[PDB]
Structure 1
Amino acid sequence: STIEERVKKIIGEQLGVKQEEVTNNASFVEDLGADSLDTVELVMALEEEFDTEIPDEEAEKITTVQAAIDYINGHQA
């Protein structure tokens, strides 16, 4: 049902922001009001939704909507 759409949906409900605000270039901390524990909780929600395990060193690089999209992109097939 589209991974980009699915990722933005997760980010939107996790950070409590409307879908209009979840742009590809938005950073979780600077743009969508997340704190450092919100970011941890968001990565976990992404892990749960896509049944994947994101290592700690890679999770730390997922700081924007695009990075989350690109990560879930290149870890399926």
Structure 2
Amino acid sequence: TIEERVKKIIGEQLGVKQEEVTNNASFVEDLGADSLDTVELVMALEEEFDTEIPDEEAEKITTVQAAIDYIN
């Protein structure tokens, strides 16, 4: 199922515990990510869902909710 996959990737990618992966948490300030990690996160999403995210959309993926919204 998809709603969970996104949560799992952010966690395996950002090295944060699943409990911290909240739809309200922005990666930069809440999950300890810097710049590039978000992008490596966006990439990891592209690669797990075998899709492509346009640069306009990928720059709007700054929170966990932002991430799930796009996949669905």
| TM-score (normalised: structure 1) | 0.91
- RMSD over aligned Cα, in angstroms? 0.6
Over residues 7-63 of structure 1, what are the superposed CA-to-partner deviations in whole Å (9 max), with x where a residue is unaligned? 000000110001011011110001000000001100000000111100111100000
1:62 paired with 2:61, answer yes
Write the distance in 1 (CA, Å) between the matches of 2:22 and 2:67.
12
Spell out structure 1 runs of 4+ moving beyond 4 A: none
What percentage of aligned pairs have identical amino acids? 100
Write the distance in 2 (CA, Å) between the matches of 1:61 and 1:71.
9
Structure 1: 5+ residue stretches without partners: none
Q: How many residues are aligned here?
A: 72
Structure 2: 5+ residue stretches without partners: none
